[PDB]
Amino acid sequence: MRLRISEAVVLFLLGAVAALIGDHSHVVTGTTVYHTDAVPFVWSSPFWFPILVGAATASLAELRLHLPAPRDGVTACQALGGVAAVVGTYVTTALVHAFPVVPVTALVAAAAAITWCVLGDGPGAAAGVVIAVIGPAVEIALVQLGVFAYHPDSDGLFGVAPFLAPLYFAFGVVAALLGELAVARRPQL
Amino acid sequence: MRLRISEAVVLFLLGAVAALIGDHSHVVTGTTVYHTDAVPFVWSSPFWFPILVGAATASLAELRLHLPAPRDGVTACQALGGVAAVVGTYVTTALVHAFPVVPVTALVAAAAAITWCVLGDGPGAAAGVVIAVIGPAVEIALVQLGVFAYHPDSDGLFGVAPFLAPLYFAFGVVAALLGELAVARRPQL
Amino acid sequence: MRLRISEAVVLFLLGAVAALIGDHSHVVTGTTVYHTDAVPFVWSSPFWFPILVGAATASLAELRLHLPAPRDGVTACQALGGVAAVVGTYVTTALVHAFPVVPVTALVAAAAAITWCVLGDGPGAAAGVVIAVIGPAVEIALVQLGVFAYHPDSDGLFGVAPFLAPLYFAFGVVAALLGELAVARRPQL
Ligand SMILES: CCCCCCCCO[C@@H]1O[C@H](CO)[C@@H](O)[C@H](O)[C@H]1O
Ligand SMILES: CCCCCCCCO[C@@H]1O[C@H](CO)[C@@H](O)[C@H](O)[C@H]1O
Ligand SMILES: CCCCCCCCO[C@@H]1O[C@H](CO)[C@@H](O)[C@H](O)[C@H]1O
Ligand SMILES: CCCCCCCCO[C@@H]1O[C@H](CO)[C@@H](O)[C@H](O)[C@H]1O
Numbered sequence: 413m414r415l416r417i418s419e420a421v422v423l424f425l426l427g428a429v430a431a432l433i434g435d436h437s438h439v440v441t442g443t444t445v446y447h448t449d450a451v452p453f454v455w456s457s458p459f460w461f462p463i464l465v466g467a468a469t470a471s472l473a474e475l476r477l478h479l480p481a482p483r484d485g486v487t488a489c490q491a492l493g494g495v496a497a498v499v500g501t502y503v504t505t506a507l508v509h510a511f512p513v514v515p516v517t518a519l520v521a522a523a524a525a526i527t528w529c530v531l532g533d534g535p536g537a538a539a540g541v542v543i544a545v546i547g548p549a550v551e552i553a554l555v556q557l558g559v560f561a562y563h564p565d566s567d568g569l570f571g572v573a574p575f576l577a578p579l580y581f582a583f584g585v586v587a588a589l590l591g592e593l594a595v596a597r598r599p600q601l
Numbered sequence: 602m603r604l605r606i607s608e609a610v611v612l613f614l615l616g617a618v619a620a621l622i623g624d625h626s627h628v629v630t631g632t633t634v635y636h637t638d639a640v641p642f643v644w645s646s647p648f649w650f651p652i653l654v655g656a657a658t659a660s661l662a663e664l665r666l667h668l669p670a671p672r673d674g675v676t677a678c679q680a681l682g683g684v685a686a687v688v689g690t691y692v693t694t695a696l697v698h699a700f701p702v703v704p705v706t707a708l709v710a711a712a713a714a715i716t717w718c719v720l721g722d723g724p725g726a727a728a729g730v731v732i733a734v735i736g737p738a739v740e741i742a743l744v745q746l747g748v749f750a751y752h753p754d755s756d757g758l759f760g761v762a763p764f765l766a767p768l769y770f771a772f773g774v775v776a777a778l779l780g781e782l783a784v785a786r787r788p789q790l
Numbered sequence: 791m792r793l794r795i796s797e798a799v800v801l802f803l804l805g806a807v808a809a810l811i812g813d814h815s816h817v818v819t820g821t822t823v824y825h826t827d828a829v830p831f832v833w834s835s836p837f838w839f840p841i842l843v844g845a846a847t848a849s850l851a852e853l854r855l856h857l858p859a860p861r862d863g864v865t866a867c868q869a870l871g872g873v874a875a876v877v878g879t880y881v882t883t884a885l886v887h888a889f890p891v892v893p894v895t896a897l898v899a900a901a902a903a904i905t906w907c908v909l910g911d912g913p914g915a916a917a918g919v920v921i922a923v924i925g926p927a928v929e930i931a932l933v934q935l936g937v938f939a940y941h942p943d944s945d946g947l948f949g950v951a952p953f954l955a956p957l958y959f960a961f962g963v964v965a966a967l968l969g970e971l972a973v974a975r976r977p978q979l
């Protein structure tokens with residue numbers, strides 16, 4: 413693989429911490445509710461949740477490095493700004509989840525579009541699309557299995573929130589950027 | 602005129618679609634209520650609403666092309682980012698309309714100022730001012746005619762929301778940018 | 791001092807006006823409540839409030855000019871954009887203060903991180919840290935003295951809101967930028 417193990421671990425941990433903050437926000441606001449008492453929880457989340465998101469973060473970063481022309485000009489502040497945009501968008505969905513589906517979903521889509529315009533490229537959008545499909549699909553399956561549920565006013569996408577599509581998209585764009593950064597920041601001559 | 606017909610039509614449709622999303626958001630949250638049952642509606646809006654906003658979008662873009670030095674360096678992502686900023690701001694007003702007038706209006710003004718700082722120029726601000734006056738004036742007349750009304754906690758500007766001023770301003774800045782883009786993206790040598 | 795008196799006065803007034811808008815927003819939404827009837831108020835604030843924040847604005851700008859390499863390339867739109875970001879963040883805290891502490895605090899921290907990534911430098915972050923400590927410390931003392939109080943759902947940081955830390959941080963970053971601008975905009979050859 414193109415990421416070094418240490419880089420993959422840092423990205424995994426980054427994704428895990430951001431996931432725990434966002435998922436705690438969803439749980440405490442009632443955006444989601446878990447129904448899986450048999451597993452160990454970490455904060456408000458089943459232990460496998462930050463592992464799934466952390467693994468997705470490292471995986472999408474790796475994916476970008478297999479797509480054409482990773483950008484060598486990516487900076488730490490672009491990456492910090494991107495992580496902040498995704499986390500801010502994530503927690504915002506917790507704050508506004510009880511509002512009507514159209515303005516809520518449009519707001520998240522606007523945040524995701526702006527994130528991509530500022531920070532992303534073509535391959536980054538591709539990674540964004542991959543997880544914007546896979547992310548919600550995994551959630552839909554987990555919800556049908558009774559593992560957790562969304563609030564009834566935020567479950568319009570086959571049991572899950574429509575805002576997941578642009579939320580995951582923005583996540584993929586930023587994870588891709590993190591992969592580019594991991595390579596770019598290596599020692600140079 | 603400086604826009605080609607095809608460009609004017611694309612801008613018209615862009616404005617119309619964004620208007621329908623924002624206006625649906627206002628209606629469904631109770632920010633506004635229509636009182637005009639005799640006309641055909643499109644989604645939540647009287648059919649003439651997206652036509653008015655769509656026409657304003659093409660008109661403000663055209664206006665910019667008659668003002669000094671349209672920028673040749675405008676990009677599709679600046680335009681996408683600007684449309685996203687205006688739509689995100691529009692739907693946000695639907696979410697926060699019931700809150701006190703000062704923080705609500707200040708929030709929209711901040712979003713509009715940031716939009717202009719990132720994307721706008723002097724002539725763009727001029728176009729912004731034109732519609733920040735005309736937009737609210739048209740709405741005030743329509744409200745006095747009983748065509749629609751604002752929620753009583755969002756009607757402080759002669760029957761309409763004070764946030765319309767910075768919302769329309771941001772709209773004008775972005776419409777101007779769309780006009781610059783329409784010309785810039787034409788085939789080059 | 792490095793600021794000229796006229797520059798320091800403009801920064802003082804800028805900070806004072808922004809403070810009055812943000813503090814009115816906190817009072818009218820019930821984020822905070824004053825308990826000091828014996829002093830003259832200006833709008834919703836004790837007269838000393840805009841003086842404290844105004845003085846802090848000029849002071850942090852001055853501080854930046856004593857730190858390494860003030861940037862000569864700072865622009866008026868960066869400064870306007872930064873002031874808008876801080877004011878927008880400030881009024882947003884008034885709108886969301888009743889929500890759970892983690893998503894509220896994370897949202898403000900994201901806004902502050904993005905503000906710094908876009909506009910700040912190392913010394914700007916240093917100024918940010920200084921006031922992110924001093925600001926909340928002053929408030930904690932004032933609250934223990936019974937001068938004002940936070941809403942019970944926004945008082946987790948020794949009687950004050952945890953969001954003050956990233957809010958003041960963003961304030962310091964932007965005040966520092968204003969100091970750089972004051973020098974940069976002086977007449978050139
Ligand atoms: C992109 C998000 C941050 C990832 C950075 C942490 C990954 C660690 O990566 C390692 O860092 C070392 C010290 O700089 C370097 O010597 C190695 O070349 C590099 O692989
Ligand atoms: C990397 C993704 C997780 C790796 C370890 C898999 C742990 C799965 O654990 C499973 O979780 C379910 C929901 O909580 C429970 O219903 C199952 O009984 C439990 O076995
Ligand atoms: C919506 C997402 C916003 C992300 C904001 C980060 C944008 C970074 O912006 C740029 O980043 C580079 C790294 O410092 C620097 O060269 C520039 O000074 C900075 O303006
Ligand atoms: C600014 C918002 C997008 C407007 C773009 C659509 C307008 C269509 O405009 C036309 O597009 C053709 C195909 O590229 C070109 O050959 C023509 O020169 C151009 O006028």
Ligand SMILES: CCCCCCCCO[C@@H]1O[C@H](CO)[C@@H](O)[C@H](O)[C@H]1O
Nearest residue numbers: 637639640647649650652653656748
């Ligand atoms: C381009 C702007 C609209 C062009 C067609 C004008 C249609 C106006 O239609 C009018 O709308 C009013 C409010 O709904 C009604 O009160 C009037 O009875 C109706 O005739």
Ligand SMILES: CCCCCCCCO[C@@H]1O[C@H](CO)[C@@H](O)[C@H](O)[C@H]1O
Nearest residue numbers: 529530676678679682683686716719
């Ligand atoms: C508040 C409004 C935010 C609009 C964000 C769009 C800013 C665009 O930002 C810049 O746009 C250009 C077009 O891709 C590119 O050259 C740059 O890579 C990109 O950072």
Ligand SMILES: CCCCCCCCO[C@@H]1O[C@H](CO)[C@@H](O)[C@H](O)[C@H]1O
Nearest residue numbers: 794796797800968969971972976977
């Ligand atoms: C950084 C926020 C804005 C501060 C600008 C106002 C400070 C006034 O500053 C003065 O302005 C004069 C007129 O331009 C100049 O001739 C002086 O050199 C300058 O010191």
Ligand SMILES: CCCCCCCCO[C@@H]1O[C@H](CO)[C@@H](O)[C@H](O)[C@H]1O
Nearest residue numbers: 826828829836838839841842845937
């Ligand atoms: C620059 C900072 C303020 C300068 C003037 C100091 C005015 C302080 O005034 C004090 O304010 C307190 C709270 O309102 C009251 O409890 C005190 O009785 C009052 O004297």
Ligand SMILES: CCCCCCCCO[C@@H]1O[C@H](CO)[C@@H](O)[C@H](O)[C@H]1O
Nearest residue numbers: 718719865867868871872875905908
């Ligand atoms: C979160 C804080 C966002 C602040 C947005 C302001 C960023 C300014 O952005 C840049 O500012 C310079 C001054 O005009 C110009 O050279 C550029 O055209 C403009 O894009």
Ligand SMILES: CCCCCCCCCCCCC(=O)O
Nearest residue numbers: 427430431495498580583586587
């Ligand atoms: C860039 C770092 C982001 C890490 C967090 C990514 C979150 C992706 C969205 C997860 C949504 C999970 C859910 O709503 O149940």
Ligand SMILES: CCCCCCCCCCCCC(=O)O
Nearest residue numbers: 616619620684687769772775776
């Ligand atoms: C850049 C594209 C934006 C199209 C939408 C522009 C909206 C302008 C504001 C319309 C407000 C109408 C109302 O609140 O009744």
Ligand SMILES: CCCCCCCCCCCCC(=O)O
Nearest residue numbers: 805808809873876958961964965
């Ligand atoms: C850049 C100009 C910003 C001026 C306003 C700065 C506000 C700093 C935060 C003050 C918070 C006061 C309070 O919540 O009581």
